[PDB]
Amino acid sequence: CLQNGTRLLRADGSEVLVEDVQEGDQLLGPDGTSRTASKIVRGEERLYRIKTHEGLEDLVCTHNHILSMYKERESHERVDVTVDDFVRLPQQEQQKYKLFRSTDATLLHINSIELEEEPTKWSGFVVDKDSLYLRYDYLVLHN
Ligand SMILES: [Zn+2]
């Protein structure tokens, strides 16, 4: 699940805050096709903040959120990993995993991932098809 205030793309390209996503809403998939959101859930807890080397917005999500990543050795493979599992990996293994944006480099390098000191509100849902959808800046997100 994602911190409230995360900016996503509706299927028509307009922006929607993650907490404004309603049952049945249509979001944008990484291939440009539609995705349907369902099972809206909300909570409040200490989230993990992920900052990249590149100048894009931090990603703030729950400990059980699934990151969709490319892991080194074409040269990379697609891997899904929860924040918990990723946080516990040695940093030398952490190299190899990169976040990614939908191809119109598109790989993003994580500089830090840290548990935040105070709880904040989050919103989550499930998405059909490949469970992937787009942040407003085309960062590829998983359910
Ligand atoms: Zn979610």
Automatic annotation (TrEMBL):
Protein name (database record): PRP8 protein
UniProt gene name: PRP8
Gene source species: Cryptococcus neoformans
Highest taxon above the source species: Eukaryota
Any one biological process term the GO annotation gives: spliceosomal tri-snRNP complex assembly
MF terms in GO: pre-mRNA intronic binding; U1 snRNA binding; U2 snRNA binding; U5 snRNA binding; U6 snRNA binding
Domain Hom-end-associated Hint residue range list: 1-73
Gene Ontology CC: one annotated term: catalytic step 2 spliceosome
